């Protein structure tokens, strides 16, 4: 908060800060925010007269339990549901539903978190960057799930199994990943 006068200047009035800290006497606690310190200073520029200023700094902590209990838990929830479409077998027909629904929930929380944030481009918050990372990961999950669902529905009458997938995906890798038929 920058207090100064528009009529007079430093050549006609001083402006003396009395106490170093603003008092906290009739303060009612806000319930959402916390005042932790209230310093105050008097700014004058040498080699630039007719300048007076008394500024008060308010450094304010947040009580964070509301946005935690309403946004952080569904964030880590829908992120935990994103490495989960691969354990579902492709013989059922419910993989693309789960993938599209996880990406839908992530875009919903991204457009929700872009509302409570100010529209500045200094830096994005860590929630938006985290959801952007997980959203790109879920999109790569969708394209590799469609690619891994194509090889499930390959019949012997329409395709020929090449010898390189014989030597790679049947002998070396089922022993590397502890499958063993």
């Amino acid at each position: 908060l920058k207090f100064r006068s528009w009529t007079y200047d430093h050549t006609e009035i001083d402006m003396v800060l009395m106490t170093p800290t603003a008092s906290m006497d009739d303060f009612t606690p806000s319930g959402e925010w916390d005042i932790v310190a209230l310093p105050g200073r008097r700014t004058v520029n040498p080699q630039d007269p007719s300048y007076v200023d008394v500024t008060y700094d308010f450094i304010i902590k947040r009580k964070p339990l509301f946005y935690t209990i309403n946004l952080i838990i569904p964030c880590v929830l829908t992120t935990l549901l994103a490495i989960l479409v691969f354990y579902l077998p492709s013989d059922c027909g419910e993989k693309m539903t789960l993938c599209i629904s996880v990406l839908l929930a992530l875009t919903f929380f991204l457009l929700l978190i872009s509302k409570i944030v100010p529209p500045t481009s200094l830096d994005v918050p860590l929630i938006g960057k985290y959801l952007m990372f997980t959203m790109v990961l879920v999109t790569f999950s969708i394209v590799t799930s469609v690619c891994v669902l194509n090889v499930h529905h390959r019949s012997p009458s329409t395709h020929t199994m090449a010898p390189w997938v014989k030597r790679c995906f049947l002998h070396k890798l089922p022993t590397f990943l502890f499958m063993k038929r």
Binding site: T79, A82, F86, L126, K129, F133, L137, F140, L173, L177
Partner: peptide, 20 residues
């Protein structure tokens, strides 16, 4: 294979973002 790969990449991503 892709389950293990994306799990490992997601763990390294969470560590590299929330390191501080």
């Amino acid at each position: 294979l892709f389950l293990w790969v994306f799990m490992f990449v997601c763990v390294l991503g969470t560590v590299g973002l929330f390191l501080p």
